[PDB]
């Protein structure tokens, strides 16, 4: 039936169905089948209590266990085009132990599998086991670990929050990989601009086995079998064409400036924080401070950090500064130099996490308090982890530089991978210190003040500093425009503009 089969019920499910509906708009809708241990009505009642426009896409609910193979046939596991195993919202170890066992039964389906498996993981220390049972059928999406890497990136560059929501959603633009033989033997310098309604980001190199190469070589020749990667609005609004006029791009060197180290506040002891310190110390300049305000004693923090793979003496960029106290008590919060923090991350604590209903609630208190303090004390980026998206919307006050992350973005992630498994290996690098990553860079490097240039100029000028310009945010527009549509119309640019690029250090 070539459908999408979801195995499990949670709160990410509602937003997961939303994102599947948006991608299926360009097909006239599809069918989604949910297989959970809830009663049919209970699942169907919640389905109808969703006011987003389904838009051609049907949702079918069934009661059963994704451990019994006999139930996997009522919903046609062997005929599903994509099989998602939803994690749960309680014990991270219990949830991952379930996901492993669903993965077992799927690999044992003697009828074979038409599609692939997308598994939502909880503890990252438990993912390398599942990439060992199912193997190739499987793409792992460690939600808890992903939520972390997003917070760090957005905490280092604001506005990236709003941008990481456009892209990572099927609203606006997203990622696609198609094969264009018309550009066989064409130089990437040329393929970069061959698209009026896209922005080529990478290539799927056939000689390597299909490896996806973000930001490749401009002399690299498209061989027989390659597939391009672009940021386009849907899987049918992008196609190549002819190389346009070289709106002239010869901007000079313009070397990048030094690296001021930053001071970061981690609020609360999230589970597996060592994973975030590792990501953080890669990004930050030498000389930085990472302050950790939580309730755990400073003496036993080093035991939990040691037992999580982290080498604190192996740390060299950041110096851990440990402080103790309750993060929902203002008396404790105001003692901190809440002025001298380049950015503050409110983490969901691991003690409260094993019943989410309480877990966000302290982050909520922690959030509103840090806000009122930053105003009350008067004569910083604030990024908060509130897992429930329902609670996020009431509190969002997104502004910019006060972004609160929700599990809607894990749904936004699972949907991306459940539509093209190779995109997971794209998001993997972009969340990774290694290689490329999404930056916001000023217009100083790219042009002079009041320069009259099309987008192809700027998109080609980005090639001399080895970057992929994927959009912009003009001087006084709330939102950044990713993949603009009028690319060959020149316009008067200014030094207060900024460009969304695909750079790498």
From Swiss-Prot:
Description of the deletion phenotype: Loss of microbial symbioses. Undergoes typical root hairs growth deformation in response to Nod factors, but exhibits no calcium spiking and nodule formation.
**One GO process term, biological-process aspect:** monoatomic ion transmembrane transport
Mode of membrane association: Multi-pass membrane protein
Localization, UniProt: Nucleus membrane
Q: Which domain of life is it from?
A: Eukaryota
Induction comment: Not induced after bacterial or Nod factor treatment.
Q: Which ranges carry the RCK N-terminal domain? A: 1-142, 261-381
Which segments does the entry list as coiled coil?
Answer: 31-56
Signal sequence span is none
Q: Record keywords: Ribonucleoprotein included?
A: no
Summarize the subunit comment: Interacts (via c-terminus) with CNGC15A, CNGC15B and CNGC15C (via N-terminus). The Nod factor has no effect on these interactions, implying that the complex is maintained after activation.
UniProt note: domains: The N-terminal domain (1-76) is sufficient, but not required, to target DMI1 to the nucleus.
Biological function = Required for early signal transduction events leading to endosymbiosis. Acts early in a signal transduction chain leading from the perception of Nod factor to the activation of calcium spiking. Also involved in mycorrhizal symbiosis. May be involved in the regulation of the calcium channel responsible for calcium spiking by mobilizing another cation, and thereby altering the membrane potential.
Q: What is this protein called?
A: Ion channel DMI1
Q: Which part of the complete protein is shown?
A: 348 to 881 of 882
């Amino acid at each position: 039936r070539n459908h999408v089969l979801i195995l499990g019920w949670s709160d990410k499910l509602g937003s997961l169905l939303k994102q599947l509906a948006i991608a299926n708009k360009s097909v006239g809708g599809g069918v989604i089948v949910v297989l959970a241990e809830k009663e049919k009505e209970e699942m169907e009642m919640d389905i109808a209590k969703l006011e987003f426009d389904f838009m051609g896409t049907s949702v079918i609910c069934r009661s059963g266990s994704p451990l019994i193979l006999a139930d996997l046939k009522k919903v046609s596991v062997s005929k599903a085009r994509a099989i998602i195993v939803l994690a749960a919202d309680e014990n991270a170890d219990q949830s991952d132990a379930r996901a492993l066992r669903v993965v077992l039964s799927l690999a044992g389906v003697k009828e074979g599998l038409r599609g692939h498996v997308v598994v939502e993981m909880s503890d990252l220390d438990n993912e390398p086991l599942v990439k060992l049972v199912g193997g190739e059928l499987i793409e792992t999406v460690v939600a808890h670990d992903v939520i972390g890497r997003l917070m760090i990136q957005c905490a280092l560059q604001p506005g990236l929050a709003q941008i990481w929501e456009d892209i990572l959603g099927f609203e606006n633009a997203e990622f696609y990989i198609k094969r264009w033989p018309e550009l066989d033997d064409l130089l990437f310098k040329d393929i970069l601009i061959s698209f009026p309604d896209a922005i080529p980001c990478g290539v799927k190199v056939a000689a390597d086995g299909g490896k996806i190469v973000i930001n490749p070589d401009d002399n690299y020749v498209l061989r027989d079998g390659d597939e391009v990667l672009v940021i386009a609005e849907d899987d049918d609004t992008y196609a190549p064409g002819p190389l346009p006029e070289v709106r002239k791009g010869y901007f000079p060197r313009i070397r990048d400036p030094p690296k001021y180290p930053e001071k970061i506040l981690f609020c609360g002891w999230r589970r597996d924080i060592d994973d975030m310190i590792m990501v953080l110390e890669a990004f930050l300049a030498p000389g930085s401070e990472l302050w950790m305000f939580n309730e755990v004693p400073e003496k036993e923090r080093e035991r939990k950090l040691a037992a999580g793979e982290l080498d604190v003496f192996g740390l060299e960029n950041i110096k851990l500064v440990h402080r103790e106290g309750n993060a929902v008590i203002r008396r404790h919060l105001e003692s901190l130099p809440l002025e001298t923090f380049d950015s503050i991350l409110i983490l969901a604590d691991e003690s409260v996490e094993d019943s989410v209903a309480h877990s966000d609630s302290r982050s909520l208190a922690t959030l509103l308090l840090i806000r009122d303090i930053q105003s009350r004390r008067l004569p910083s980026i604030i990024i908060s982890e509130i897992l429930d998206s329902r609670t996020r919307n009431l509190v969002s006050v997104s502004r910019i530089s006060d972004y609160v992350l929700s599990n809607e973005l894990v749904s936004m992630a699972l949907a991306m991978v459940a539509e093209d498994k190779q995109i997971n290996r794209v998001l993997e690098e972009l969340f990774a210190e290694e290689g490329n990553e999404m930056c916001i860079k000023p217009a100083e490097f790219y042009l002079f003040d009041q320069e009259e240039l099309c987008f192809y100029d700027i998109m080609i000028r980005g090639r001399t500093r080895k970057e992929i310009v994927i959009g912009y945010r003009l001087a006084n527009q709330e939102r950044a425009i990713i993949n603009p549509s009028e690319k060959s119309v020149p316009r008067k640019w200014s030094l207060d503009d900024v460009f969304v690029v695909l750079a790498s250090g």
